[PDB]
Paper text:
In this study, we report the crystal structures of three forms of [name], which showed that this protein forms a canonical DUSP fold and that it undergoes an atypical temperature-dependent conformational change between two forms. Structural and biochemical analyses revealed that this structural alteration requires the presence of the GG motif in the P-loop, and that [name] has dual amino acids, Asp63 and Glu132, both functioning as the general acid/base residues. [name] proteins commonly share a highly conserved active site motif called the [name] signature motif, which is also present in [name] as HC93MGGLGR99. This motif, constituting the phosphate binding loop (or simply called P-loop), contains the catalytic cysteine residue (Cys93) that functions as a nucleophile for dephosphorylation and the conserved arginine residue (Arg99) that anchors the phosphate group of the substrate during the enzyme reaction.
The recombinant [name] protein expressed at 25°C in Escherichia coli was purified at room temperature using a Ni–NTA column and size-exclusion chromatography, which was subsequently subjected to crystallization trials at 18°C. Triangular prism-shaped crystals were obtained, which were used for determination of the crystal structure of [name] to a resolution of 1.7 Å, referred to as [name](form I) in this manuscript. The asymmetric unit of the crystal (space group P212121) contains one molecule of [name](form I), in which a central β-sheet constituted by five β-strands [β1(Lys6−Asp9), β2(Val12−Ser15), β3(Ala32−Val34), β4(Glu55−His58), and β5(Lys88−His92)] is sandwiched by four helices [α2(Val69−Glu85), α3(Gly98−Arg112), α4(Leu116−Lys126), and α5(Gln134−Arg146)] on one side, and by two helices [α1(Glu22−Asp29) and α+(Leu46−Arg52)] on the other. The overall structure indicated that [name](form I) adopts the typical DUSP fold, composed of a core region (β1–β5 and α2–α5) and mid-domain variations (α1 and α+). Similarly, [name](form I) adopts a distorted P-loop conformation in which the backbone amides of Gly95−Gly98 are oriented away from the active site pocket (left top). Structural alignment between the P-loops of [name](form I) and DUSP3 bound to 2-(N-morpholino)-ethanesulfonic acid (commonly called MES) shows that the main chain backbone of the residues Met94−Leu97 of [name](form I) are arranged differently from that of the corresponding residues of DUSP3. Furthermore, steric hindrance occurs between [name](form I) and the DUSP3-bound phosphotyrosine-mimicking molecule in the superposed model, demonstrating that the active site motif of [name](form I) is not suitable to accommodate a phosphotyrosine moiety; therefore, [name](form I) should have limited phosphatase activity.
Author numbering: 2 to 147
The structure:
């Protein structure tokens, strides 16, 4: 699925799949982290279940940061699926800052990367995408705990 950009061998991030795209995406991933809010969702997250995909719904408002504890819980969940041999998709929508934040966090969490190097790696895979200052702050908090 070309919207998905992989950040390691098993974890990717992307924009939101449309409902017509679900059959395709569901054959490429085993689990999905949904970071959009319910007022951004054009379908029920049931549609993933009906296609054999397990879901973690961790809503974050657009342009804002998750809490650091919310971040760590999402990271632990991704790690669980990865350890099971599964491929995981992190998606948000819009400017992509929310999935960008979680993807940078994942590189710090799983590979031990510093924040500044994790930011550089995600930055190159998404030309023109930025994290807001609020998202930068929680990532710094994550670095200070990790």
């Amino acid at each position: 699925w070309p919207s998905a950009k992989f950040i390691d061998g098993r974890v990717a991030f992307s924009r939101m799949p449309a409902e017509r795209e679900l059959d395709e995406v569901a054959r490429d991933f085993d689990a999905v982290v949904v970071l959009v809010e319910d007022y951004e969702l054009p379908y029920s997250l049931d549609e993933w279940e009906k296609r054999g995909v397990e879901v973690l719904h961790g809503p974050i408002p657009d342009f804002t940061a998750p809490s650091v504890e919310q971040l760590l819980e999402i990271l632990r969940w991704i790690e669980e699926r990865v350890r099971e041999g599964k491929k995981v998709l992190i998606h948000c929508m819009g400017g992509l800052g929310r999935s960008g934040t979680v993807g940078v966090a994942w590189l710090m969490y799983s590979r031990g990367l510093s924040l500044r190097e994790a930011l550089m790696e995600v930055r190159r895979k998404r030309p023109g995408a930025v994290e807001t200052q609020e998202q930068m702050e929680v990532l710094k908090e994550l670095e200070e705990r990790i």
